[PDB]
Design a protein around this ligand. Structure first.
Ligand SMILES: Cc1[nH]c(/C=C2\C(=O)N=C3CC=C(C(=O)N[C@H](C)c4ccccc4)C=C32)c(C)c1C(=O)NC[C@@H](O)C1CCOCC1
Length: 503
C-alpha cells in the first residue's frame, strides 16, 4: 500500500542538512536510546558493532524475557542468565556489574525467584551505557542517521500526506475517517473538527486540550495521537484505528448480555492500565462507559474519546458536572472539587456492567428518569449476584464507594492499589503490558460491527503541530520503512548521505 516512490518521499536528507538539529536536540540518554523507538534501535545497532558493548544488549533482552516469564519457569530462566552473562568465564560476560553485584544476585537464585531479580544488574548496566558508550554513539554514523530520521519526522504534514477513506463514525463535533499515510500505507482514524463549528461554539480551548492530552499519553491501552494537521475548513486529529467494535456492542449484542468473569477480568486489567497511563500525566478521563472502550484487530482494547478529559494541576482539584447519565461518580453529580476519583468509579461501573449485563443503578429492562438514576448513584447500594465471585464483588463495591476518600485507587498509591486487589490475583500485569496474554475474543478481519479573523490564525499554529514523535517512529518501524531505508555502506562504511564530503 506504499505509494510508488515512497523511497523518495522518505529519502534521507544529506547529513549536512541536520546541523541545526544536532545543536538543538537534547542529548538525554533515556530519550535518545530508549524512549524514541528509532533512537533505541540505532543505539542498539551501534552496540552491535563493538564486541565489548554487544554483550550488554543481549543481557537486557534476556532480562526483559525474564520479567514476563511464567512464575513456574523463573528459576529455569534465571539460572540460564547467570551461566551466560554473569559467569566471569563466559564469552559474553557483563564486566561492569562488579563482582560485588554478581555474588549478590547469585543469592536471590538460592531462594524462591522474583521477577525483578535482575533489576539491580540491568540498572547497573544502564549506568555504564549512560556514560562512555552513549557519548561514543553520539559521535557515530548511527546518531547522524538518527538525525536524518528526525529531519524526516519534522517535515510538514498536510492533507497531501494522507489518503482519506470511508467515514468510520461521527460524534458531537465532527466525523471519523480511515486515514492512510501514502508513503508508509499505515491505516489511521481521523477526527475532523470543522473550523466553522468550533469557532461558533467558542470551544477552541477544548480542541487543543484534547489534542495535547492525546499527544502526551503513550499508552498501549489509550488511543494515541500520530499527527495533528490543519486543512482548509477543518482541524484534523490522526488517531489509532480500532476495527474491533466497542465494548457496549460486545456486552449486549455478542454477550449474554455480559461476559464471563474471567473475560471481564481481561478487559478490566487493560482498562486499568490505560487509566494508570493517563494518571501518570495527572489527567482525569471522566468519560468511562462501555461504548468508549474500543477493540482493535487483535482483541485488545483502548480507551477512546478523550474530549471530556482534563489535565489536573498537581496538588489542585477541579470542578465539572460532565459525562453521561449513569456513569457520573457522586462527587461529580454534586458538582464538587474532585481529582482522579471519577475514573475509578467508572472502572467499577464497567466491571459490574461487563459481568452482570446491565448497569449497577439501572436495569437493562428498566424505564427510569435521569433523576431517579442519579438518586440511586448517591443513595442506593448496588446489589450483586452469583455471576460475581467474592473477589469480583469486593473490587466492584470498593470501586463503587460513594465517598471518593475511601474509594479504591483514590489513595496516594493510585492504580497500584487496584492491581493488588484479589480480583486480579490471577492476572500477571507484566505479561499483559507486554501483550503476551491472548485476548478472549478476536474480531474477524472482514467483520463490520457498526472566518478571516487573525486570532484564529494563532489557534491553528498551536494545534497543527504535525507529527507526534514516538508514534511516527513506530509507524516507520511497523511498515518496515525503517528496515528498508536504514541501510549503511557495505562492510561498515559510510553511505553517500552520511558522508559530508560529496552531497
Ligand atoms: C473503524 C472504527 N473507527 C472507530 C472510532 C475510533 C477509532 O477507531 N479510533 C478512535 C479514536 C478516538 C475516537 C473519538 O474520540 N470519538 C469521539 C466520540 C468523537 C467525538 C467527536 C467527533 C468524532 C469522534 C474514535 C475512534 C470505531 C469505533 C470503529 C469500528 O469499530 N468499526 C467497526 C467496523 O465497522 C470496522 C469498519 C472498518 O473496517 C471493518 C471494521
Amino acid at each position: 500500500g506504499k505509494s510508488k516512490k515512497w523511497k523518495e518521499i522518505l529519502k534521507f536528507p544529506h547529513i549536512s542538512q541536520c546541523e541545526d538539529l544536532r545543536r538543538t536536540i537534547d542529548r538525554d540518554y533515556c530519550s535518545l536510546c530508549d524512549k524514541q523507538p528509532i533512537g533505541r534501535l540505532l543505539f542498539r545497532q551501534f552496540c552491535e558493532t563493538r564486541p565489548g558493548l554487544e554483550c550488554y544488549i543481549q543481557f537486557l533482552d534476556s532480562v526483559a524475557e525474564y520479567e514476563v516469564t511464567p512464575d513456574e519457569k523463573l528459576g529455569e530462566k534465571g539460572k540460564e542468565i547467570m551461566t551466560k552473562y554473569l559467569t566471569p568465564k563466559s564469552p559474553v560476560f557483563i564486566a561492569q556489574v562488579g563482582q560485588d553485584l554478581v555474588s549478590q544476585t547469585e543469592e536471590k537464585l538460592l531462594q524462591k525467584p522474583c521477577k525483578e531479580l535482575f533489576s539491580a544488574c540491568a540498572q547497573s548496566v544502564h549506568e555504564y551505557l549512560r556514560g562512555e558508550p552513549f557519548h561514543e554513539y553520539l559521535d557515530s554514523m548511527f546518531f547522524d542517521r538518527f538525525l536524518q530520521w528526525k529531519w524526516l519526522e519534522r517535515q510538514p504534514v498536510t492533507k497531501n500526506t494522507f489518503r482519506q477513506y470511508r467515514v468510520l463514525g461521527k460524534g458531537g463535533f465532527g466525523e471519523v475517517c480511515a486515514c492512510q499515510v501514502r508513503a508508509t500505507g499505515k491505516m489511521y482514524a481521523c477526527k475532523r473538527l470543522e473550523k466553522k463549528r468550533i469557532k461558533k461554539r467558542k470551544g477552541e480551548s477544548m480542541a487543543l486540550n484534547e489534542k495535547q492530552i492525546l499527544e502526551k499519553v503513550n499508552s498501549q491501552f489509550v488511543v494515541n495521537l500520530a499527527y495533528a494537521y490543519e486543512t482548509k475548513d477543518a482541524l484534523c486529529l490522526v488517531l489509532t484505528i480500532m476495527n474491533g467494535g466497542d465494548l457496549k456492542f460486545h456486552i449486549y449484542n455478542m454477550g449474554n448480555p455480559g461476559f464471563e468473569e474471567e473475560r471481564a477480568l481481561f478487559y478490566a486489567a487493560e482498562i486499568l492500565c490505560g487509566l494508570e497511563d493517563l494518571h501518570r500525566e495527572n489527567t482525569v478521563y471522566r468519560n468511562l462507559k462501555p461504548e468508549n472502550i474500543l477493540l482493535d484487530d487483535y482483541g485488545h482494547i483502548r480507551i477512546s474519546d478523550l474530549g471530556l478529559a482534563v489535565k489536573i494541576p498537581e496538588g489542585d482539584l477541579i470542578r465539572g458536572r460532565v459525562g453521561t447519565v449513569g456513569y457520573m461518580a457522586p462527587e461529580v453529580l454534586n458538582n464538587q472539587r474532585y481529582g482522579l476519583s471519577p475514573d475509578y468509579w467508572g472502572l467499577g461501573c464497567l466491571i459490574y456492567e461487563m459481568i452482570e449485563g446491565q448497569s449497577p443503578f439501572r436495569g437493562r429492562k428498566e424505564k427510569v428518569k435521569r433523576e431517579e438514576v442519579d438518586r440511586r448513584v448517591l443513595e442506593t447500594e448496588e446489589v450483586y449476584s452469583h455471576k460475581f465471585s467474592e473477589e469480583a464483588k469486593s473490587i466492584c463495591k470498593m470501586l463503587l464507594t460513594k465517598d471518593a476518600k475511601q474509594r479504591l485507587g483514590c489513595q496516594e498509591e493510585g492504580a497500584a492499589e487496584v492491581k493488588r486487589h484479589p480480583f486480579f490475583r490471577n492476572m500477571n500485569f507484566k505479561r499483559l503490558e507486554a501483550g503476551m496474554l491472548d485476548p478472549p475474543f478476536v474480531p474477524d478481519p472482514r467483520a463490520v460491527y457498526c472566518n478571516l479573523d487573525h486570532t484564529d490564525d494563532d489557534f491553528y499554529s498551536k494545534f497543527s503541530t504535525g507529527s507526534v514523535s514516538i508514534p511516527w517512529q513506530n509507524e516507520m518501524i511497523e511498515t518496515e520503512c525503517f528496515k528498508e531505508l536504514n541501510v549503511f555502506g557495505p562492510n561498515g562504511t559510510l553511505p553517500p548521505d552520511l558522508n559530508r564530503n560529496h552531497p
